[PDB]
Enzyme design. Structure first.
Site, PDB file in Angstrom:
ATOM      1  N   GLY A 265       9.305 109.694  20.633  1.00 30.31           N
ATOM      2  CA  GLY A 265       9.547 108.590  19.722  1.00 30.31           C
ATOM      3  C   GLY A 265      10.309 109.006  18.481  1.00 30.31           C
ATOM      4  O   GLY A 265      11.269 108.348  18.080  1.00 30.31           O
ATOM      5  N   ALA A 266       9.872 110.102  17.871  1.00 29.58           N
ATOM      6  CA  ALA A 266      10.521 110.636  16.683  1.00 29.58           C
ATOM      7  C   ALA A 266      10.021 112.041  16.385  1.00 29.58           C
ATOM      8  O   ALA A 266       9.356 112.665  17.211  1.00 29.58           O
ATOM      9  CB  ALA A 266      10.281 109.729  15.486  1.00 29.58           C
ATOM     10  N   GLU A 302       5.714 109.137  10.922  1.00 32.90           N
ATOM     11  CA  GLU A 302       6.489 110.278  10.449  1.00 32.90           C
ATOM     12  C   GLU A 302       6.431 110.416   8.930  1.00 32.90           C
ATOM     13  O   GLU A 302       6.597 111.515   8.397  1.00 32.90           O
ATOM     14  CB  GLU A 302       7.944 110.169  10.916  1.00 32.90           C
ATOM     15  CG  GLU A 302       8.108 109.896  12.411  1.00 32.90           C
ATOM     16  CD  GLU A 302       7.449 110.943  13.301  1.00 32.90           C
ATOM     17  OE1 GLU A 302       7.215 112.080  12.839  1.00 32.90           O
ATOM     18  OE2 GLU A 302       7.161 110.622  14.473  1.00 32.90           O
TER      19      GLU A 302
END
Ligand SMILES: [Mg+2]
Ligand SMILES: [Mg+2]
Ligand SMILES: [Zn+2]
EC number: 3.4.11.-
Length: 884
Positions: A265-266, A302
């Protein structure tokens, strides 16, 4: 195969103080010059100097500006750089090297690689060693001075950690930028970005220190208009961490960057987070509703890494300490932002389906494993989602006030999982008002694998007004622990008066610390119906031992969203298990005629009741009309015949449909105005989660009506395809599978999707998930016309993964489905081992199916294992999954 053990941790014999990087990007190669200012630690025993370095082409290496010679002074086997101890200094020294890497052909998407026209880095967990030589472990803290040069036309935007201190021109049409990042950080938090990026910007002013913060979101020029929601989410994330945890952003600038090719995803890096495009970019016209909750959670996730990552990871075994905690903080954020009960329900639904499967599979492991071979296989739903539930239980036990105290103690003092448990234990002592109170037993949540089973029995005496709840906990032994120990299980309970649906007691969290316990309640005027594990207060199998009548009453009148949801789930499972065995028995005995037990009539009445209730939540309604996930069901069935389950599901849906289809259609029509309201369609910052839930309900109802072949429903499907919302006209495609206008909408929706990279990938998923009899022929069509030889993980996953959830077709008794995915896995493993492992997910339940399908899956896995060029990543995964 080298196996790393948690009990074998020892501090490095070396110290890395300063990292000075020069990354020179060219057309065919990238040259990386690195100077490491090093020292000798107190744990040194005169051992060799061993650097991590994978796929690095050495031009020259040196110690104190003196070139080292190959063979005599050092050896390199494309994995480790071994410098013999006699040539290693015994005081402060400088190690330098110049290597060549090739981001253009780095299709594994780890380390430094090129995504379309963007150079980007991915260093977690062991990616930095693919860029330059380093002691690639998270406990090696160092300062970073990074200089990046490239062609100014191709890569006008250069990004890295810290402050950009210099920008200079270079002869030949090149340019350079120097980034100095003084604070110490592990190398997996290093990042570099180069490309022709466009951006949206904003200024955030912190709550307490009033520090102004520049916020930047980056993407390629074509999709720059899809950055708005991500920017708003970033603002929301910073405010929440300030309002809830009292934490401010420490730096003067934060960057978000989206790339098309990304394994997950990140990822987080200091002041520079790098995203999969499908988790950062969105627009009302080119994205389904799911992207908005997705971007919110991922951007939030994040960012929540920032403050904890700024001050506090000893080794990779403690991965759940930063991931479980962050996901927990991510989930608290999402619940607060969405203000919908389905948010929490969605997290539980994923845990009990995906993670529970894993925890009962041969891949079962505790949230803190004792060993590993590949770190790329370490990032699991167990570490992440069960880890989150473990972190969440701290809050349930301590309450909001004392949890924030324990959390603050953790941040201020610091690490390992024990360090966090210690801080929480301090808050636990304060709350219990006692210094003898401890949380030593709670550590078992970190070390013990498998899902605990919690069962109940009850007793009520009308005369003494006394209610008793007898609780029992149990965990099946596995290959990790021969004997399972009782856990600290917090059970949030309520008592519902079945006569008026009122709460009978205040908020109560039962603390189960033994194998079994009896909780007694006095002054209970009437026999209550217990509301157990409210909000899913523990990651366990719940066995309420309630009747369907009691469950229905909870479903209708209980205050807790989950218990209502779970009660409905339990009613479904009882029906599913019953009908399954009836279908199975008829099959095994080859009966010409037999009987099936109908769905509870009062249960169907309760569904009608909730659906027709205008003050009830739309998202919650979509859950109660849907049977439990297949991967949740399989945990309760031995030797699962997928065809029998498919028949079971079909019968139950038909039973309920035969009663409620008219109700479904009426709601689908009445919900239209509010669900498809276009008032804020071009307001990209206006997101209504309640409205999107209404569309979720409409699309769910439409799917039910389509499968039931409701009279003239095709008219609704056609009009639904003309809707501006992608969630709608993609739904129209999938539900039209049962009609002769499927391929008509196939072409229509393709034309709508083809000019947007992310939207097309959603179109691929929709086609892949289409309930079509000719699905295998259709998949071939996608391969030849759309997918081709793409190495984009988003493309490969979109085409194949949704298809694997097709119960009847993917589990075809010929094994053609297993063979198909196996070929895709082997093909993918040649360039991307991580994604190849991701594509193995359908095989995770292989030993839970019927004997024939067990054999078929096992053969394909053994075939994949026999591939001469199999990656270690894939090899280790399949070896553990097949218990070899
Ligand atoms: Mg190489
Ligand atoms: Mg991550
Ligand atoms: Zn994370």
């Amino acid at each position: 195969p080298k196996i790393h053990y948690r009990k074998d941790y020892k501090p490095s014999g070396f110290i890395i103080n300063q990292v000075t990087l020069n990354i020179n990007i060219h057309d065919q190669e990238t040259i990386v010059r690195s100077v490491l200012d090093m020292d000798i630690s107190k744990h040194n025993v005169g051992e060799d100097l061993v650097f991590d370095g994978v796929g690095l082409k050495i031009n020259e290496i040196s110690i104190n500006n003196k070139k080292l010679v190959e063979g005599e002074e050092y050896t390199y086997d494309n994995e480790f750089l071994t410098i013999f101890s006699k040539f290693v200094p015994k005081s402060k020294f400088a190690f330098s090297s110049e290597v060549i890497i090739h981001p253009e052909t780095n299709y594994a998407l780890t380390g430094l690689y090129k995504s379309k026209n963007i150079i980007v880095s991915q260093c977690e967990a062991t990616g930095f060693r693919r860029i330059t030589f380093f002691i690639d472990r998270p406990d090696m803290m160092a300062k970073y001075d990074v200089t990046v040069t490239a062609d100014k036309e191709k890569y006008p935007v250069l990004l890295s950690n810290g402050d950009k201190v210099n920008e200079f021109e270079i002869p030949g049409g090149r340019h350079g930028a120097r980034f100095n990042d003084p604070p110490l950080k592990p190398c997996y938090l290093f990042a570099v970005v180069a490309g022709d990026l466009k951006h949206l910007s904003a200024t955030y002013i912190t709550k307490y220190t009033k520090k102004k913060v520049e916020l930047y979101v980056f993407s390629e020029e074509k999709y720059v208009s899809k950055l708005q929601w991500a920017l708003e989410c970033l603002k929301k994330s910073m405010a929440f961490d300030e309002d809830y945890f009292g934490l401010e952003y420490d730096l003067s600038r934060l960057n978000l960057v989206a790339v098309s090719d990304f394994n997950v995803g990140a990822s987080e890096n200091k002041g520079l987070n790098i995203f999969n495009a499908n988790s950062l970019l969105a627009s009302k016209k080119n994205s389904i509703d799911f992207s908005y909750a997705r971007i919110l959670t991922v951007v939030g996730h994040e960012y929540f890494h920032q403050y904890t990552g700024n001050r506090v990871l000893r080794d990779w075994f403690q991965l759940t300490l930063k991931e479980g905690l962050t996901v927990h903080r991510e989930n608290l954020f999402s619940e607060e932002m969405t203000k919908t009960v389905t948010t929490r329900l969605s997290h539980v639904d994923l845990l009990r389906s995906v993670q529970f499967l894993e925890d009962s599979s041969p891949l079962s492991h505790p949230i803190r494993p004792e060993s590993y071979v590949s770190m790329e296989n370490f990032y699991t739903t167990t570490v992440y989602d069960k880890g989150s539930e473990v972190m969440r239980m701290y809050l349930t036990i301590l309450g909001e006030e004392y949890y924030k105290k324990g959390f603050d103690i953790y941040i201020k003092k610091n690490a390992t999982c024990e360090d966090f448990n210690y801080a929480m234990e301090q808050a636990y002592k304060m709350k219990k008002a006692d210094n003898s109170a401890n949380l030593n037993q709670y550590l078992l949540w970190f070390s013990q694998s498998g899902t605990p089973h919690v069962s109940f029995k009850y007793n009520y005496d009308a005369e003494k007004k006394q209610y008793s709840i007898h609780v029992n906990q149990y965990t099946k032994p596995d290959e990790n622990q021969k004997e399972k120990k009782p856990l600290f299980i917090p059970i949030s309970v309520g008592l519902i008066n079945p006569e008026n649906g009122k709460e009978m007691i205040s908020q109560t969290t039962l603390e189960l610390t033994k194998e079994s316990d009896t909780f007694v309640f006095n002054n209970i005027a009437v026999k209550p119906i217990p509301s157990l594990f409210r909000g899913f207060s523990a990651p366990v199998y719940i066995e309420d031992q309630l009747t369907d009548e009691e469950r229905i009453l909870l479903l209708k009148y209980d205050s807790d969203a989950f218990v209502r949801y779970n009660s409905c789930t339990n009613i479904y499972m009882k029906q599913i298990l019953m009908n399954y065995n009836e279908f199975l028995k008829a099959k095994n005995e080859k009966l010409e005629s037999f009987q099936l037990t109908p769905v509870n009539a009062q249960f169907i009445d309760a569904i009608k009741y909730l659906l027709e209730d205008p003050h009830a939540d739309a998202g919650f309604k979509s859950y109660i009309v849907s049977l439990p996930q297949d991967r949740y069901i399989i945990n309760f069935v031995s030797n699962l015949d997928t065809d029998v389950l498919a028949d079971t599901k079909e019968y139950i849906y038909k039973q309920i449909g035969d009663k409620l289809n008219d109700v479904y259609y009426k709601m689908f029509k009445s919900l239209e105005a509010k669900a498809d309201d276009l008032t804020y369609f071009n307001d990209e910052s206006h997101v209504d989660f309640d409205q999107m839930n209404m569309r979720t309900l409409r699309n769910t109802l439409l799917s039910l009506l389509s499968k039931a072949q409701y009279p003239n429903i095709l008219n609704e499907i056609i009009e639904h395809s003309k809707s501006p919302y992608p969630s709608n006209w993609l739904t129209s495609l999938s539900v039209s599978a049962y009609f002769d206008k499927y391929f008509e909408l196939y072409d229509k929706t393709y034309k709508l999707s083809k000019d947007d990279e992310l939207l097309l990938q959603e179109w691929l998923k929709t086609v892949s998930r289409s309930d079509r009899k000719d699905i295998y022929e259709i998949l071939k069509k996608l391969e030849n016309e759309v997918l081709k030889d793409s190495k984009n993980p988003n493309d490969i996953r979109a085409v194949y993964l949704p298809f694997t959830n097709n119960l009847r077709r993917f589990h075809d008794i010929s094994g053609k489905g297993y063979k198909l995915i196996a070929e895709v896995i082997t093909k993918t493993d040649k360039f991307n081992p991580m994604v190849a492992t991701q594509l193995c997910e359908p095989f995770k339940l292989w030993n839970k199916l019927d004997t024939k399908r067990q054999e078929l899956m096992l053969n394909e896995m053994n075939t994949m294992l026999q591939e001469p060029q199999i990656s270690n990543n894939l090899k280790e995964y399949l070896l553990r999954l097949t218990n070899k």
